[PDB]
Amino acid sequence: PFTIDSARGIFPETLTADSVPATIARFNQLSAEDQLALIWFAYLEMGKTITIAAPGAANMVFAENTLNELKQMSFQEQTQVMCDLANRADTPICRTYAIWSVNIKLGFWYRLAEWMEQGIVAPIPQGYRLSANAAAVLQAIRELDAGQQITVLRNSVVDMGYDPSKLGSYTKVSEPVAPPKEMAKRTPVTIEGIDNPTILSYMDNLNANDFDALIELFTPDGALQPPFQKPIAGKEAVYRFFREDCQNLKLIPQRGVSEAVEDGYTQIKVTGTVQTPWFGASVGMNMAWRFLLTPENKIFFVAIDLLASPKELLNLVRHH
Ligand SMILES: CC1=C(/C=C/C(C)=C/C=C/C(C)=C/C=C/C=C(C)/C=C/C=C(C)/C=C/C2=C(C)C(=O)CCC2(C)C)C(C)(C)CCC1=O
């Protein structure tokens, strides 16, 4: 009947932005030097219309030792470390970076971007010439919508460093968890077409960084699938993902539809936008949420999708 694997397929008319993994695959064909140059140029152009937020103090304490090593290196040595990261080389810095959470790696590169601008780290060489393929990948990124662009950039960062699979057993380094926003101060979401209390609780608890309440919405074996990734299965792993990767999001759902399927279960699709704390309101990612709920309104499965275009925000099929 329903398994996690079959639940992945609900609302199959939902068109996701698979140009993100497509573009990443093209990017991964390029030399390390062209990868760095390409991201430099893309980030420079993006900055003209989107506004990145500075990393917090606790984010940066974990990257500090590595950044100070870099601050001291020659321009040549600095470039070599950056190429090592892009190449996923086996070096001490690449092994250190492999155990950092997503947001720590992002803060590392945001500091390097500042330093490269303002003189401290080796710039991209003046008159650098991208390969023909790299020039085309950069143009492809320019034509993506902002939500797709920042997803490509983040993925490129997350994939650098030594393969964490190749490390064995290892302590993942992550920020302290923010406290749940006071109940009184929360702003509840509204969703046109949906009043299911679990769906509203999922949105509101995530918006409040209240992961202990969020996780109780799931079945013990319930799964969550982030954009372009495999399902994270079971409360233990979902709860860790929440606390590690999901703080300070702003979910802005707009509309949804609900459909009874077999055995008192119910499949629900919501569309809307999401803001990441890295860009705030300057980037609104067009998202769908696809939930499979038990008769007791528990989340058996939820998939979160980055949508191919804004048209898909209105794609809400009520009968299958
Ligand atoms: C690297 C590099 C550079 C620098 C580059 C830099 C500094 C790049 C920086 C890039 C940054 C900061 C990108 C951040 C992206 C964040 C995203 C896509 C978050 C999405 C979250 C979502 C969708 C969450 C959704 C969620 C919802 C709704 C749920 O319902 C459930 C949870 C879930 C998580 C699934 C240089 C400029 C120096 C050039 C050299 C070079 O290589």
Q: What is the resolution of this structure in A?
A: 1.6
Q: Encoding tokens for residue 216?
A: 């109780």
What is the distance between the alpha carbons of residues 151 and 147, in angstroms, rounded to a whole number? 6
Residue 298 CB contacts under 8 Å (≥ 6 apart), including other chains: 198, 217, 218, 219, 222
Q: Is 27 in the pocket of ligand 1 (CB under 6 A)?
A: no
What is the distance between the alpha carbons of residues 102 and 277, in angstroms, rounded to a whole number? 13
Could you tell me the domains of the chain?
17-167 (1.10.2090.10), 189-320 (3.10.450.50)
Pocket test for ligand 1, best of 39, 83, 207 (most atoms within 8 A of CB): 39
For residue 150, report the distance from its CA to the centre of ligand 1, in Å.
5
Atom of ligand 1 nearest to the CA of 109: 7
Please say whether the beta carbons of 304 and 227 come within 8 A.
yes
- Rounded alpha-carbon distances, angstroms, from residue 24 to 28, 98, 158, 273: 6, 19, 12, 23
Q: Encoding tokens for residue 4?
A: 């996690």
Please say whether the beta carbons of 207 and 185 come within 8 A.
no
DSSP one-letter code for 231: P
* Cα dihedral sign, 111-252-205-292: negative
